[PDB]
């Protein structure tokens, strides 16, 4: 089975071509921390710690072109599938993990054995190591699950509230000419307030969720980075 | 001065980007693509009827049956298949003629 | 149900179907056509890359002796749990 | 005897149970901001920084509720 379909970004691609044929400065980035990993001067890393910047920027642009514009009615999030997001996070996360593993430095994993020598190795430390190795994969799964669920829940709520507002607006506006007009005006004002609140909440949540999506990947990278001191 | 992004053409830069900048990511992506097309590229007729149609499956015309009929007619005509062969029917040709005369 | 239906791709254009047997056979023919010429010896890494893994996987399938039944991959109906056939 | 019974309304019950998860999530979020205030009145020079962390906490804590909510939808639309 081969399905031929298209993304919902063609107009946005047209706008990108029109508005970015000439150069422009970028000074606001959703996830700026990918550019500043080191905060104490004289510290440097021999690992390619800035390799994630390009992927981070492209991912932010792509997910923003989809998620933020999805607030417009009838706009479709073409990639909104659980397993597709799993594939995306698998790519990024496992690629970086395999980059660290291909380094063939086993000492890098010494920190997985949690605790000190005082703790019993077999009954405490080894079980903590098992849990931490499990937690890495669980972090990948939680990242993709969190990205999927936020979009799904937010848009379900928006659809349901919009349906209710359409119903009351169309089939009960006549009460403005009736003696119970005050009740309808109260309800209508409440619906407008709820409309604005939901839109603001979704706008904030989309950006914040992209921030956390990139932060999880950068945290994976940072967990295995070692910094040398210049002398 | 020479820069890959400014001096190289797009296909060349694409190869360079995914071979000397993000080779592991490309490898993992290809791995995942192969897995998807090896294990997630099939849909049964019942699955199509349940979920494969926007408004629902139009049983009143049964497009799946027409599609399969076209498929099998094309295969038979192109491959010169004798569908009256005993292996397809489970009985000899003479028995088939007897059945035709009976019914 | 109706709200759930709003989360589908909105620009589906065409769907094509192909049997696994057919395109696997066509791919094998292409591979044989490109790996046949004399100027590609059997001991070259390219030839082994093309052939060895496929041979190994097919051998693993043939050697399989499972006590359970694996339903046909391409049945007409695979949605009924109580009917593997 | 052996009866294959299919009850339909049960999907409501389960759905409601999932919503109970939010009772924690909501509460948890409040706790964060509670402490945030007690942290801003204890070292106001860091207010902005603290706010950022709070938002991070909110986004992590809220995430969990969504999981529960998803399940509700799955059972409510099936």
């Amino acid at each position: 089975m081969f399905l031929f379909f298209f993304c919902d970004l063609f107009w946005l691609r047209l706008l990108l071509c029109m508005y970015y044929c000439v150069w422009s400065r970028l000074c606001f980035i959703v996830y700026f921390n990918c550019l500043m990993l080191i905060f104490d001067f004289l510290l440097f890393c021999l690992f390619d710690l800035y390799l994630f910047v390009g992927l981070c920027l492209f991912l932010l642009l792509w997910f923003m072109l989809f998620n933020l514009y999805s607030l417009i009615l009838y706009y479709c999030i073409t990639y909104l599938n659980l397993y597709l997001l799993f594939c995306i996070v698998f790519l990024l996360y496992i690629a970086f993990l395999f980059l660290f593993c291909f380094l063939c430095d086993f000492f890098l994993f010494n920190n997985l054995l949690v605790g000190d020598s005082f703790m019993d190795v077999f009954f405490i430390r080894f079980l903590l190591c098992f849990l931490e190795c499990f937690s890495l994969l669980c972090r990948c799964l939680s990242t993709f699950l969190r990205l999927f669920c936020n979009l799904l829940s937010s848009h379900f709520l928006l659809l349901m509230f919009f349906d209710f507002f359409y119903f009351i607006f169309v089939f009960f506006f006549y009460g403005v000419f009736c003696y119970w007009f005050i009740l309808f005006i109260f309800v209508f004002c409440f619906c407008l307030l709820f409309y604005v609140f939901l839109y603001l909440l979704d706008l904030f949540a989309a950006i914040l969720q992209l921030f956390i999506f990139c932060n999880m990947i950068l945290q994976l990278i940072m967990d295995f980075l070692l910094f040398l001191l210049f002398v | 001065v020479y820069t890959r992004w400014k001096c190289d053409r797009l296909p060349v830069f694409q190869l360079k980007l995914f071979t000397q900048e993000y080779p592991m990511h490309a490898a993992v992506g290809i791995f995942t693509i192969i897995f998807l097309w090896k294990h997630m590229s099939h849909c049964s007729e019942e699955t199509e009827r349940k979920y494969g149609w926007w408004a629902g499956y139009p049983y009143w015309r049964d497009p799946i049956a027409r599609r399969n009929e076209t498929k099998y007619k094309q295969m038979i005509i192109n491959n010169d298949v004798d569908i009256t062969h005993p292996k397809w029917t489970g009985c000899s040709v003479e028995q088939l003629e007897e059945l035709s005369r009976v019914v | 149900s109706n709200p759930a239906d709003h989360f589908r791709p909105n620009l589906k254009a065409l769907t094509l179907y192909a049997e696994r047997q057919h395109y696997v056979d066509r791919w094998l023919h292409v591979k044989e056509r490109w790996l046949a010429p004399w100027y590609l010896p059997w001991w070259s890494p390219l030839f082994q890359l093309g052939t060895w893994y496929s041979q190994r996987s097919r051998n693993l399938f043939l050697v399989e002796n499972h006590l359970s039944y694996r339903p046909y991959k391409f049945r007409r109906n695979d949605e009924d749990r109580n009917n593997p056939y | 005897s052996t009866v294959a019974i299919s009850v339909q309304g049960l999907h409501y019950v389960g759905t409601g149970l999932a919503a109970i998860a939010l009772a924690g999530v909501g509460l948890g979020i409040g706790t964060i901001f509670g402490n945030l205030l007690v942290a801003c009145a204890r070292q106001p020079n860091l207010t902005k920084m603290l706010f950022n962390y709070a938002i991070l906490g909110f986004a992590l804590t809220e995430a969990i509720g969504l999981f529960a909510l998803m399940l509700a939808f799955l059972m409510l639309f099936s």
């Binding site: 399905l3 492209f58 | 979920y51 | - | -």
Partner: peptide, 29 residues
């Protein structure tokens, strides 16, 4: 829910893979 479905997952994921392998270089340059 199609978001929970897998009957056309490969073709669906081709959109992401095309964005990653073919559109990202153009946006990059």
């Amino acid at each position: 829910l199609e978001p929970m479905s897998t009957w056309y997952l490969a073709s669906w994921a081709m959109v992401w893979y095309y964005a990653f392998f073919f559109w990202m270089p153009m946006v990059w340059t």
